Design a binder for this molecule. Structure first.
Ligand code: MG
Lengths: 210, 52, 49, 51, 327, 105, 47, 49, 48
DNA sequence: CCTGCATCCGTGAGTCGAG
DNA sequence: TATAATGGGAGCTGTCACGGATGCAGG
């Protein structure tokens, strides 16, 4: 204030007191610290794979067995990402894919009622929570609210991709049946692989008593 | 039984990398490390030392 | 012959089955003491022995 | 061309968007009265295709 | 570990307001909005724009995002341009900037302070088709609406005015999102009314009512058909993964045929139909061929007309073998 | 999926990555000359909620006065840890004390 | 028609597998010997 | 046991409707919702193993 | 009976709770038109 | 601190038929 | 759209045996 006469001694945030006619700077820093997939993705983009490969290579020469082991385990992932041409930040999702409606059908059965896949409900959760997150962002919601919302979003993506993987599995109202995620569809004894690929039900077949 | 055991014996673990880009303790197929070694020998390079 | 508005959905005897029809039951909406599940106009049962 | 290989790899967000025929916006399925796919819904024909 | 316990912990971090603090924050908010209107009268910018710039500066550099309401994209560059056009105003005018800033800060503090109320309200709405946390979030939206719409002049404690909006938003959410097939809110009201009515009638009658009795207790305009159709529209779909049997073996969706894709016999039906029609058309003269096939649309997909009609009547009565295709 | 791929690349334990992704603790991309507990903030450091709140927003505390009791110290006066703000109240931290809602003018 | 049965083509369940793997954000590509993409959707899924 | 479950749920409903509404005009008819009990028993006799 | 603690007003009533399925003479039930049987379940007797 | 053993967590657990 | 209301609620209990990672006390 005062045309540049009075300035600040320390880093901090400004509270202008009009009553006491004083500019009070609370001691604080501009420090950039985040939470969740934003922070993690940022950390992923910054990664220089060649550099880390070099560091891990230097670590590979240490007389300790465990250190060489862990350095190897890391270097395998690093070199995997290197050779594959895959950016590590792709492990974090911006655009979530949406499966074609016929692989998650809403279809009227014989009785005139409707039958629908659980993927539709999971997608519904995800979409609703994403919309609410966007609206809360545009309306200038506080910290804690946006935090909880982002957490819920992450758990909705979790529920969609693999359900019951982390925490208690998402279920339908008044039901203990865990919903079927994409992971549940692919793997397992009832999974797409074993059930619909390695074996099939076939036409031109029959059976009877011998 | 010999077929199955043969499938069990398929893998090796690198004891020393030699002149390769391979790492110590890395596990790869015996065939692959043998072709790699035969290529390095033809290149005059020090081969990879591996444990069954 | 002009195109007809409806199509033949009729209940037919399944393969390898059959017999003599012993009984029939017909429940209709608007009949005394008869109420079906919502939307259902009528329900027919056929007992074949 | 006969398929001689199958490759699996991570999908970039740009790739995921290059797959999509549109963004699903509303968390809606079908109209209650018409039983037709709702616009910008999970079943919307303007995205996935004609019924 | 548990998301709800974590949220309840993060909620217990903000201490509850004393009456003086509540009044103070509300006052600062209201005067802040007034100050924004004032700055709009001074600078000549959009009240929404100025508000979002003030908010941008209060929240931090972390949050700057394009607002659907604004006429321009809000980047930090633009918020700095506008901030520089606000700061360069005369002193007595520049006062309102500070007023608005502390207004926004007070708003944030006020919303964060009352978050427990949303929990205690949403705990009554459990099991209605929405998760606890979702109810909590929509209730939070209600709380924000309350903060923006609150008037401290009326000397009413903030919880009173906020509770209404919280219930409003929670209920709006329960009505909107709780059904896979979306039914408009008023129709949901109708359905719920019908259900309550049926429960009453069945409570007094010692048995489940008919459609006519429901139509009676429903009043004018209501008959059996409408009750039946309304109950019909209120039916929720069932999951294809609904377990069939005691074990994990098969799903309900494995018993449902696909009525869309033609079975091989249907493709063969079209094939044999086009074939038989093509081969039995030998009667056709060329002009009548192109014109009658344009009549029936056998070419581009959409007096001699009469002679071709008559000739087709002639060849129908001939072979008597095409009946099969006619179902 | 153990061992975590993301966790392996960025060198974080399952517990830590869990804490960050699910919004328990923060993590620092740009310290910006921050200092906590006498040691400056290193990048890739996990901060609790309280720690980040203190670094970003500063430290402060409010002390309630029993009704009808004047304080021992005035408005805008500097305060040292241990210095009592009232006959019944002692301050935990340093910094400036301020008057919240004076009952008597 | 009394003729011999035609050469079989790609089973639908593998297509279902590919699309379900895509919804998991994993790209599964069918390739030729020259490492070029082969389209099993016949241009139906490509814009 | 299922009767007991539905009964406890009914009780939860009773308390929930007790806290709200007019504290003056209320009757056991307006307090008691039998739906959870009916649903418990019906679920038992229909869908139990 | 609804009993007010403060007021003391006691409002007594008989409310209809729905129906309980009845067991037939032979020991079975009729649920939705179909004859059913509830199978007795052995388990560990509670205690210490 | 580097090695070794104790402990936790996730992953599996036959086929077809009928319901 | 205004009395005031300010931290949830159910839990699922009698398998068994493995690989891998993670951690702690001990040499
Ligand atoms: Mg009527």
């Amino acid at each position: 204030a005062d045309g540049g006469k009075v300035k600040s001694d320390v880093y901090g945030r400004v509270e202008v007191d009009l009553v006491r006619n004083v500019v009070r700077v609370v001691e604080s820093y501009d420090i950039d610290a985040r939470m969740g997939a934003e922070a993690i993705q940022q950390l992923l983009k910054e990664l220089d794979l060649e550099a880390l490969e070099k560091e891990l290579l230097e670590e590979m020469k240490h007389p300790s067995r465990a250190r060489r082991a862990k350095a190897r385990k890391r270097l395998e992932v690093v070199r995997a990402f290197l050779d594959s041409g895959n950016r590590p930040e792709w492990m974090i999702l911006e655009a979530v894919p949406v499966l074609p409606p016929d692989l998650r059908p809403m279809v009227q059965v014989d009785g005139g009622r409707f039958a629908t896949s659980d993927l539709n409900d999971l997608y519904r959760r995800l979409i609703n929570r994403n919309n609410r997150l966007k609206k809360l962002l545009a309306q200038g919601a506080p910290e804690i609210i946006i935090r909880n919302e982002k957490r819920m979003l992450q758990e909705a993506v979790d529920a969609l991709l693999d359900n019951g993987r982390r925490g208690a599995p998402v279920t339908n109202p008044g039901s203990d049946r865990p919903l079927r995620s994409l992971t549940d569809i692919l793997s397992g004894k009832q999974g797409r692989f074993r059930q619909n690929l390695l074996g099939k039900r076939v036409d031109y077949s029959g059976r009877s008593v011998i | 039984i010999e077929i199955v055991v043969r499938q069990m014996m398929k893998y090796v673990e690198v004891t020393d990398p030699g002149d390769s880009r391979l790492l110590e303790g890395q596990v790869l197929e015996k065939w692959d490390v043998e072709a790699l070694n035969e290529r390095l020998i033809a290149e005059g390079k020090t081969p990879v030392a591996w444990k069954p | 012959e002009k195109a007809r508005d409806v199509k033949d959905t009729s209940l037919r005897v399944p393969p390898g089955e059959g017999g003599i029809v012993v009984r029939t039951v017909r429940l209709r909406r608007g009949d005394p003491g008869v109420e079906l599940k919502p939307g259902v106009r009528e329900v027919v049962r056929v007992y074949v022995a | 061309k006969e398929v001689r290989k199958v490759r699996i790899a991570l999908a970039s967000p740009e790739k995921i968007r290059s797959w999509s025929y549109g963004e699903v916006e509303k968390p809606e399925t079908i109209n209650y009265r018409t039983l037709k796919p709702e616009r910008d819904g999970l079943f919307d024909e303007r995205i996935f295709g004609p019924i | 570990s548990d998301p709800v316990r974590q949220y309840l912990h993060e909620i217990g971090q903000v201490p509850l307001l004393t009456l003086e603090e509540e009044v103070e924050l509300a006052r600062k908010v209201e005067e802040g909005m007034e100050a924004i209107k004032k700055l709009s009268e001074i600078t000549g910018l959009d009240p929404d724009l100025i508000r979002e710039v003030v908010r941008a500066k209060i929240l931090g550099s972390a949050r700057v995002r394009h607002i659907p309401g604004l006429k321009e994209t809000l980047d930090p560059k633009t918020v700095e341009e506008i901030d520089q056009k606000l700061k360069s105003l005369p002193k007595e005018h520049k006062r309102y900037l500070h007023i608005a800033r502390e207004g926004e800060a007070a708003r944030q503090h006020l919303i964060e302070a009352n978050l427990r109320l949303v929990v205690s309200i949403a705990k009554k709405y459990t099991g209605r088709g929405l998760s606890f946390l979702d109810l909590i979030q929509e209730g939070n939206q209600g709380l924000i609406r309350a903060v923006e719409k609150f008037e401290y002049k009326r000397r009413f404690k903030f919880s009173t005015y906020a509770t209404w909006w919280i219930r409003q938003a929670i209920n709006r959410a329960i009505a909107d999102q709780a059904r896979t097939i979306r039914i408009p809110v008023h129709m949901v009201e109708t359905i719920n009314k019908l259900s309550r009515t049926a429960r009453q009638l069945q409570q007094e009658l010692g048995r489940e009512p008919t459609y006519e009795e429901i139509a009676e207790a429903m009043g004018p305009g209501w008959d059996a058909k409408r009750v039946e159709e309304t109950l019909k529209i209120a039916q929720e779909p069932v999951s294809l993964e609904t377990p069939i049997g005691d074990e994990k073996d098969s799903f309900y969706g494995d018993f449902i045929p696909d009525e869309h894709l033609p079975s091989p016999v249907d493709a063969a039906t079209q094939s044999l139909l086009s074939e038989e029609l093509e081969k039995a058309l030998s009667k056709l003269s060329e002009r009548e061929a192109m014109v009658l096939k344009l009549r029936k649309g056998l070419i581009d997909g959409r007096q001699i007309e009469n002679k071709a009609l008559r000739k087709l009547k002639y060849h129908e009565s001939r072979t008597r073998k095409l009946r099969d295709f006619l179902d | 999926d153990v061992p975590s791929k993301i966790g392996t690349l960025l060198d974080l334990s399952a517990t830590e990555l869990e804490q960050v992704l699910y919004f328990s603790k923060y993590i620092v991309l740009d310290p910006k000359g921050a200092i906590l507990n006498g040691v400056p903030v290193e990048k890739r450091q996990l901060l609790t909620d309280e720690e980040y709140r203190e670094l970003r927003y500063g430290k402060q505390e409010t002390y309630p006065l029993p009704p009808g009791v004047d304080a021992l110290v005035k408005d805008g006066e500097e305060v040292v840890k241990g210095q009592e703000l009232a006959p019944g109240v002692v301050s935990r931290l340093d910094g400036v004390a301020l008057y919240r809602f004076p009952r008597r003018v | 028609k009394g003729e011999d049965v035609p050469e079989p083509s790609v089973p639908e369940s593998f297509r279902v597998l590919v699309k379900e793997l895509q919804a998991l954000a994993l790209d599964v590509q069918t390739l030729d010997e020259k490492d070029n993409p082969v389209d099993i959707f016949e241009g139906l899924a490509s814009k | 046991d299922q009767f007991r479950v539905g009964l406890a749920r009914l009780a939860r409903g009773v308390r929930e409707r007790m806290l709200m509404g007019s504290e003056d005009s209320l009757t056991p008819a307006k307090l008691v919702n039998s739906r959870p009990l009916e649903a418990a028993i019906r679920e038992f006799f229909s869908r139990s193993q | 009976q609804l009993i007010h603690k403060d007021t003391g007003l006691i409002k007594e009533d008989e409310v209809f709770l729905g129906h309980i399925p009845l067991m037939t003479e032979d020991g079975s039930f009729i649920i939705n038109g179909a004859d059913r049987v509830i199978v007795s379940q052995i388990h560990r007797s509670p205690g210490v």
